[model samples]
Target: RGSHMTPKDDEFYQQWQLKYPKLILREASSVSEELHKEVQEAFLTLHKHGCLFRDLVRIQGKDLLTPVSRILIGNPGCTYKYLNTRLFTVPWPVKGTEAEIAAACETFLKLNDYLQIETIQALEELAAKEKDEVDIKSRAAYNVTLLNFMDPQKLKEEPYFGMGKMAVSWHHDENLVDRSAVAVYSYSCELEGRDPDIWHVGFKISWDIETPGLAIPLHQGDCYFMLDDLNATHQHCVLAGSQPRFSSTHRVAECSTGTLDYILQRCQLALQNVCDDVDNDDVSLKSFEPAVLKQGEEIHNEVEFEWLRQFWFQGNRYRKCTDWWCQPMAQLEALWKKMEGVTNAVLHEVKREGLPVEQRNEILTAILASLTARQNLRREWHARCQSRIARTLPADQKPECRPYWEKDDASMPLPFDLTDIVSELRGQLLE
Candidate 1:
C-alpha cells in the first residue's frame, strides 16, 4: 500500500533483487499472513480449472474415496438365478384375451351352424348329382386321377424314374379341408457332385377345419349374418387346395457301398461253378449230371439274384440320373402291372357288393369315375415321361429303345383306382 506496487511488479522486483544481492540490504518478501492468503488463492484457481487434488494420509480416508468410482461405475458379479429372482418377469395369459375369447365363441357358433347347413346341402346335392342312382362316379374319377399320377411307366419315362410308390389319402366327405389337402410333399436328395433327386412323399395331417351346416365366416360376424350378407363368404369358407405333408412311404434307400462288390462276388462264384462243371467232364449240352445240374441251378439262382440286384441298382441310378434317363422303365412297368392287378380286383369286389341297388350303383359309379380319372392321369404322366425320355436320349439312341410304355400304354387300363379306394378305406379305419 505504501509503494502502491502491483503483484507483477513486486514479483519482478523480487527477482531482480535476488539476482543482484548488493542492490538491496533486506530483500522484500511476502509476510506469513500474505503467503497464506496467496496459497489459498492458488487452490481456488485450481478448483476453478476443474482439477481437485486430494492427499490421503489416514487409512480411513484412503479407503473411503479410493473405491468410490469402482463401486459406482464398474460391473458387479451376478448370476442368472439371482437376477431372475430380483428382476421383473411377466407371466403368460391365464386364458385368452377378451377379444380372443369372444372370437373363439363366435367361431364355434358359426362353424356349428355352417356344418349343419352344409351337411343338408351336401346330402341333397349328392342325391341330385347321383339322380337317385345312389352312385358317386366322381369318387371313382378322383381315384383314377390318383392312379394315373402314380403310374410307374409314366414316372420312369419322366426325367427321374419309377413312380416310387403310389398312395391315395382320403378324408371324410364332411371334412372338406382334409379331403382337399394333399398329404404329400416333394423331397429331393443332395448328393456330392450331382443334381438333387426329387420324389413325391406322403404323410397324414389332422383335419380340424370343417363347418358343414352354417356359413363359415370369411370375416368377423354372426353365422346367420355372414351367410345372408355375402355369397362370396360361402365361396371363401370352402376349403380347397393342396399342401405337401411329410410321407413315411417316400423314404430314400440308404446308399450301400458294398452292393457292387457283392454283385461282382456273386458273378465270380457263378462263373467258377460253370468252370467246375466243365472241368468235371459233365458239361453235356442236353442232360447234365446231378452235381452239374445242381451247379447249374446254383448258377441260375445266382444269376437271377444278381439280375434282381442289378435291377434295383439301375432303378436307383435312374432315380439319380440327369437329363431324364429311363434305365429302370422295364422293372417299373412290371411292378405297375402287378399293383394294378391287385387294385383292380379290389375295385371289382367293391363294385359287386350286395346292398341297396342305389348304394351298389353309387359304389360302381364312384369306382368307374375314379378309374376314368386315373386313366387320364396315367396318360398324362406317361406322356410326360415319354417326352422327357425323348428329349434326354441321345439322338442316335432314341430309335433303338423305342418308347418306354408302347406295349403297356396300349394294354387295357389296370384297376389302379381300386388300390386308392382300399388305401383310403384302410387309412380311415385302421389309423
Candidate 2:
C-alpha cells in the first residue's frame, strides 16, 4: 500500500481485497494531515515518557516465561488485558491525565470514522444479517493501546530472534469482546532520518493449511480495521522490515462483571484472613497479617486498578523511572485509606480482648513493626531506583526507544528483586 509496489504484488493485494471484503485497509494519503499529526504526537509522547515496557508472556503450550520487548499502554475505564498479560496505566502525555487521553482517542477515532456512527451502524447491520442479537456498539468499548516497538538490531540477534523477535507471531487476539473489531495505526522512524519500506500482514485460517496465506503490504501512516469473523476464524501476523517502527493496535477487550467481582472477592478474602487471626485466642501478630493484607491490595491493583503499574518491578529501565508523587499520588492515597480500615479494626480487636499489659504491648509492637516495615520498603525502593537512574540516564537524555539496552547490566546493577524482597520480608516478619 504504497506508491512503489510491483505490479504482481498489487495484483495479489487486489485479489486478497476481493476475497476478504470485511478487512478495511485505507491509504495514509486519504486521511487528513492534521489527524495524522495528532496520532503521531500521542505515540511519540508516550514513548518519550517511558510509559511502555516489555511484559512476560507465555506462548500457548509452553511452560516457560519469556520477557517480550514489545510494550503496551491502556485506557483507564477499559482494561487492556490479553495474552495472559495486562498493560499498566500511565498519564497521557498529551493532556497530563488519563481521562483526557481517553477522550482524545475517542475524538481521533471519530474523526477517522473508524468507530464513528457509520461504522457502528454497519456493524449492527452485519449482526442483524447473521440473526445475532448482540449489541455491537456497546460491546466495542475503547480498551487498549498495544504498542509493538521493533528494532532491527535486536531482530537480527540470536536469542531475541529465537524468542519470536520483532515480528508478531500468527495468532488470533485472545480475550476480545465477541463480534468486535480491532483498529491499528503504524508509525515509522530512524535515528539517522531515512524513509522506511513497506511491511506485509499475512492472514490465513490456521498453520495446518499448506496454501500460501493472503498478504497485504501496509506502509507508514496506513491504518486498517479487522472486523467480526476475521479474528474469530482467521489468524494474522505482522512481518517487519529492517527499519525501526511501532504500531498502536487498539481493541475492545473482555472485562466483564465476572472479572471485576473476582478481583474484589480476592481482596475481601485476604482481609478476612487477617481478621480471623485477630479473632483467635492464641493469635500471633508476628505473622505480619497486615503485610499480607497490604500485598493483597497490590494484587487487587494489578487486576483492576484504574491506574495500572507501568513497569514490571524487575529488569526493565523504565521500572526505575516513574515518580509516584505525581499523578498516581491520589490513587496511592485511596489505597492508604483502605489500609487504615484494616489497621483500625485490628486495634479495636486488641482493646476488646482486654489482654494483660505485657500481651497488649507485644500486639502493639507487632502492628507498629508491620507498618514501619511497609513504609521502609516503599521509601527504600524509590530511593534506590532514583539513585540508579541518576547514574545511568543523563539529565538531557529521554528514556524512549532504548528500553532494553541496560537491562540487568553489570554497570547498572539493581538493588533488589521485588519478589525476593517481599518474600524475605515475609520470612523476617514471621515468628
Candidate 3:
C-alpha cells in the first residue's frame, strides 16, 4: 500500500510537516512515543536539508502553527525560527495560481512599452510642426525692416558692446565669467482671469564663428507697447543686465489694436541702431546694398559667406532665412499668430453661448489651460530641434559651430507630443 506515504500523496501537507520536523507537532505530550519518534525522524530529514524551524512554519501556513508553538516551547533559544515567510502568498481570490502572476507581469511590461513608444512618436510630430512655425517667424522678422529697427543710433557705437553700461559693469566686475553673448527680444501679453491667457514671443541672436566675417557682437533688448483707445504707448523696456524699466506704474493695457506686422516693424526700428553699427563696419570697404550686406574682400576671405550659408541653410532649410536672427524671430511670430486665432475662437464661443458668470469663468479657464498646454508643446518641439542640431554636429565642431538660438541650457529636450500620450493614459485608466 506504499505505507500510506507515497511521494504523490494528496495529503502531502501532513507528510511535509513530518519530513520537515521544524514543522511537525507529534513530539508534543498529546502524542504517543511512537508518533514522537516518527516526527523526530522527519524533522531530522529537514535539518539535513538545512531547513530551519521558522522556515517550516512559513511554508506550512496556519495548519502548522500549532505544531510550531509546541516545538518552540522546548527550544526557546533557537534564533533561526522566524514567523515571516520567504514566499508570501497573494491575497485571497488572487493566490495559488502561477498564471495570474505571469499575466500581471505581462500587463505591466506592455504598458511600459506603450508609454515609451507613444512619447517618442509625439516628440517627432511636435518637432516637425514647431520647425515649420519657427521658420515662418524667422522669415517674417528677416524681411520686415521696421521690426529690426534700433533707436538712439549712437548707442550701437558706444564701444560698450551696444549692451549699455550695466553689461559692461558686470563684465568688469567678473572678468572670468562666461556669459551668453546673444541678445534676444521678448514680448508678453496677458488677458484677464483666474489663470489669464498669457503669450510671449522672443528673438535671439548669437555670434557664430563658423560664419566667417559675419561675426557681430551681441547686444539685444526688448521694448513693448500697450495699445488702448486706438493709441499705442510704450509700456516696457527690458535690457540685458541689472533691472528692467517699466513705462507705467499701473498695469499697461494689451496691444490689441496694432497688427503683428505693425508691432514687428516697430521692433525693427527699435533695433535699427544696432543694424546701422553692423553696417558701418563694411561701409568703407564694401558698398551698401538695400536687400543684402556686401562684405569686404579681406573679411570675406577670413570667413567665407558660403560657409555661413551652408551652416544656416543645410538642415531644416525652410526654418531659417539668409540672416540668422530673422529665422527664429519669424517662427515665433507665426506661433503667436496661430495662438491669437485660438484665443479669438474661444472668445467667440463664450459670446455665442452667453454663458452665466460661473460658466463663463469655467470656459475661460479651460481655454487658458489649453493655450498653456499648446505653448508648452511648442517649447518642447523647439527644444527637440535644438537637441537634434546639437547632436548632428561633430564633437570637435560642436563647441564652435553651435548657434545661439538652440542653446536653452536650463531645460532638457522633451518630446513635443508627450501631452497626447498623457491624455491617452488618462482616458484609458480613468474610465
Candidate 4:
C-alpha cells in the first residue's frame, strides 16, 4: 500500500493479498531481459520441432488412465506422476541442426537446471515455517508428482532439486503431485498489464476443494517465495497470457528416491500409451475408394488406421494400448485392419488375373454394412463417456471436467455420424 493511499496503490494491494498476504519483491541481478527472450525463443523453437508438445494421452479406460502436459527438469532420470497421469523426462534437445540452435538448447537446460535447484532449495527451507498456511486438504490435494514416489536413496546418489517447466501452466500449484513443499519462483512473463490473458499468475483464497480465488496481476519480472503450506494449501495457476507465458518453477518434492532400477521401465511404458487421431478416419481412407488398393499402386495406408499401425509398431511385442471405448474401439480398429489386408490381397491377384466387378462389389458391400455397425457402436461408446462421466459432474463443479479426451465435444457438430461415408460406399457398390 502507499502512504498517500492512492487509488492504484490500494487496488494493487487487494490483489496481492489474494496470493500472499505477505509478498516478497527483491533484486534479481541474476536475471536478464536478453536471456529471458533467448530462453523463451528456445522453448518455442523446441515446440516447433516436433518435440515439446508430444507428451499427450487420454485415459486408457474408465476407462482409467492419467495425463500430463508439462516438462520435467532437475535430476536427469527422475519423473513425476499423478492420478494415473505420468510425465516423463524429455532429454534436453541439444541436437539442433545449426550450431547456434544447439548451443541455445544446451544453455537453456543448464540454466533450467540451475534455477530448478534454487527454487526447490528455497521451498525446502521454508516448508515447515509456513505449515499452518495450508488448510486441511493438504493430504489428498495433489494429483501426481515425483515427490509422492521418489526412491529416497537416490537423494544420496545426487542430492538434487527438481525443477519443472509447466507447459502454458496449471490451475493449481505444482506440488499437487510434485510434492513441492515450499514452491518458490520468480515468474518473468511477456505480457501482464497489456494483455491480461497471456503470461501471468492467478490466486485463490481457499485450496480446500475448489474456489474462485482472487487474481494478483504480476509485472514482467516479479520474484516471490510461497513458503510451506502456501503451495499445498492455496491453489494457483500460471495462465498463458495473449502470447503464452514462461515460468521456471523449482521445487524438490523431497521424496524417497533410491534403489530403483525399475523406475524408468514403468515410466517408459506409460509414455508409450496415447490417444488416437480419430478425425483422420476418412481423410486417407477416402482416397482409396474409387481407386482400389493395388500392391504396387503406391498404397498410402496399407495398415488401415494409425491406431492399428501403432498397435503393431514395435513388433506388437512391447506395444501397449489404451482401453478407451475398448469394445467398440477394438472392433472398429480390427475390422478396418482386416478390410485393408483383404483389399490388398484381392487387388494383387486382380492385377495379375482378371476379376469380375460383381465379386469386388459384393466384398465392398459387406464392408459398408460392417461400417454402419461399427458406427453405431462408436456412437454408443461416445455416449457412454458423456452420460456416464462428462455430464455427471457435481452441480458445483464445472461441466468442463470432461475426463476422457476421446469423448466428442458436445458444442461441436456431430463427428462423421458414419451416415454420409457409409451411404456413399453403399451407392458406389450399387454403381
Ranking 2 against 3 by TM-score, winner: 2
Model 4 lDDT vs. the true structure?
Answer: 0.36
In model 4, where is the ten-residue run with the lowest total lDDT? 155-164
TM-score of every model? 0.19, 0.55, 0.15, 0.40
Backbone collisions counted per model: 32, 0, 29, 26
- lDDT of candidate 2 over 1-431, digit per residue (tens): 11212224545556565555566676688567887777776555555554545543335633222322444444443335555444443312323434334444454445434543434655666556545334666544545556666655553211211212226666788878786777777766631111224455656665434434555556778777777767877777765666666677767667662233444455555445343434323322223344554454444333222222222222343333333223433443333334444444455554565556555445554455454454455444344334444235444322222111233554222222234433543443353
Candidate 1 per-residue lDDT, tens place, 213-255, comes to 1111111111111111122122211211122111111001111
What are the runs in model 2 whose C-alpha is more than 4 Å off? Answer: 1-19, 60-71, 91-134, 156-166, 189-196, 257-266, 269-431
lDDT of 1: 0.25
- Where model 1 places Cα greater than 4 Å from the true spot, the runs are 1-335, 350-356, 365-369, 387-389, 392-431
> Which stretch of 10 consecutive residues in model 1 shows the poorest summed lDDT?
67-76
How does candidate 3 fare on TM-score? 0.15
Tell me the spans in candidate 4 whose CA falls farther than 4 Å from its real position.
Answer: 1-30, 54-70, 92-105, 113-170, 174-198, 207-212, 219-225, 253-431
Flag the better candidate by lDDT, 2 or 4: 2
lDDT of 3 by residue, 1-431 (tens): 00212223455445433332111111123224453343233232322332222112222233122111011101001111123211111111211313433232232223223322332333344345535433322211110000011111111111212222211111110110121011122212111111112111111112311211111112211222111111111111222222221110011111221123433443343223132444221212121221111111112211111122222322332111112224433543333333232233334444565546554444444434343454464443334334543445443223122122333432212222335533532343333
RMSD of 2: 10.9
